[PDB]
Write a protein that binds this ligand. Structure first.
Ligand SMILES: C[C@H](C(=O)O)c1ccc(-c2ccccc2)c(F)c1
Lengths: 115, 114, 114, 115
C-alpha cells in the first residue's frame, strides 16, 4: 500500500465517508491518464489504490470529489474538488499518505512520506 | 497596532463576526492577567488591542470564544474556545497578526509577523 | 477587485512573496484557457487580476506555484503546485478572496466571499 | 482507548515523534488538575492515556509541547504550545481522536468523535 488517502470532515468531526477519489498519472504527452480510483471507507480511508510495481516514478494527481460530498449533506461548497499534485518515487520507492481535512469553504491537505 | 487578530469562518466562507477575544499576559507569579479584549468587526478583524508602549516582551495568550460563535449559529462545536500562546520577542520592529480559521470541530491558527 | 489571492508562509510566519499565480477559466470545450496571472506582492497579496465585467460566471482555477517558492528557500516541497478550482456564482454582489497557507508538505486554502 | 492524540509535522511530511503531551481535567474549583501525559510514538500517535472508567464527563485540556519539538529541530517556533480544550462525554461515553498538524508558525487541530 504505497498510496493511501484519508479524508476527514471538519464540520461533523468525523471521517469523510463515500468520498470519490480519482488518481491520475502525467503521461509522456503531458496528459493526465487515469491511474486508479475509489471511494473512502467508513473510516475515511482509501487503500489498495495501487501496488509498488505499478506505482513508478512520475507526477501524480489525486483528485478528491469534495463537491459531491458536501451536496449530499445539503451544503453548497466553494470548491469543485480538491487536487493534490506531486512527483512520486523520484529518489526510489516511498509510501505516501495523502490526508485532507474538509470544510465547505476550506480544505487542508498534508502528506506523510515513509521509506 | 502591534497586535491584530483575524477570524474566518470555514463553514460559511466569511469573516467570523462578533467573536469575543480576550488577551492575557503571563504575570510574574505565572498567572494570566487580563491585558485586552474585544469583539471581531464585520471584517472578522480586531484592531487597537494594545499599543507599542504597553506591548512589552512577555508571554501572551489570545483566547477566542469560538463556542459562543457556533452556538449562535445553531451548531454544537467541539472546542470550548481557541487559545494561542506565544512569546512576544520584540527584538526588532515587529507587528503580530494572529489569524484563526474556524470550523465546528477544527481550527487552524497562524501568525504573520512582519 | 472581484478576485484577490493571498499567500502566507507557515514556516517563516510571513507573507509568501513573489509567488507566481496563474488563473484559468474553463472554456466551452472543457479546456483551461489562461485568464490572468501575476506574482504576490511584499504583503503576500495579488490584486487586480480581473474586473467585474470580465469575471463572468464560470469555473475558474487558481494555480499557485508553490514548488518554485520552496526551492528558492532551499527546501524540497512535496506538491508541484497548489490548485483551487471553484465556480463563480455571481448571484449577488460578491468579492472572492482565495487564501493559501503554505508549508513544505502541506497547504490549506480557504475562500472568503463577501 | 477513549482518548487518542496524533501529531503530524507539516514541514518534514512525517509524524511528529517524541512530542510531549499533557492532559488536564477541570476540577470543581475551576483549576486544571493533571490527568494524564505521554510522548508521541514513532507514528506520531499517543495511546493509552486513559480508560473508559476514568474518562468521565468534564472539560479537558490537551496541551501539546510544540515548542520543544521545533527547538530540537533547530527552528524557533511561534507558539509556546498548542492547547485543545473541550467538554467530553457530556451525552455519554465517546471516543476522541485529537489530531494536530504542526508548522513553526501555524498549527491546525481537528477532532474525530466516535460512538
Ligand atoms: C492521516 C491522519 C489520521 O487521520 O490518522 C491525519 C489526518 C489529518 C490530520 C490533520 C489535522 C488537522 C489539520 C490538517 C490535517 C492529521 F494530523 C492526521
Amino acid at each position: 500500500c504505497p498510496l493511501m488517502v484519508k479524508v476527514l470532515d471538519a464540520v461533523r468531526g468525523s471521517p469523510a465517508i463515500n468520498v470519490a477519489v480519482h488518481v491520475f498519472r502525467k503521461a509522456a504527452d503531458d496528459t493526465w491518464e487515469p491511474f486508479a480510483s475509489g471511494k473512502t471507507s467508513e473510516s475515511g480511508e482509501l487503500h489498495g489504490l495501487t501496488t509498488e510495481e505499478q506505482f513508478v516514478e512520475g507526477i501524480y494527481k489525486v483528485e478528491i470529489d469534495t463537491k459531491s460530498y458536501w451536496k449530499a449533506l445539503g451544503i453548497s461548497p466553494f470548491h469543485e474538488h480538491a487536487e493534490v499534485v506531486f512527483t512520486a518515487n523520484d529518489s526510489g520507492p516511498r509510501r505516501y499518505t495523502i490526508a485532507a481535512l474538509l470544510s465547505p469553504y476550506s480544505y487542508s491537505t498534508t502528506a506523510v512520506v515513509t521509506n
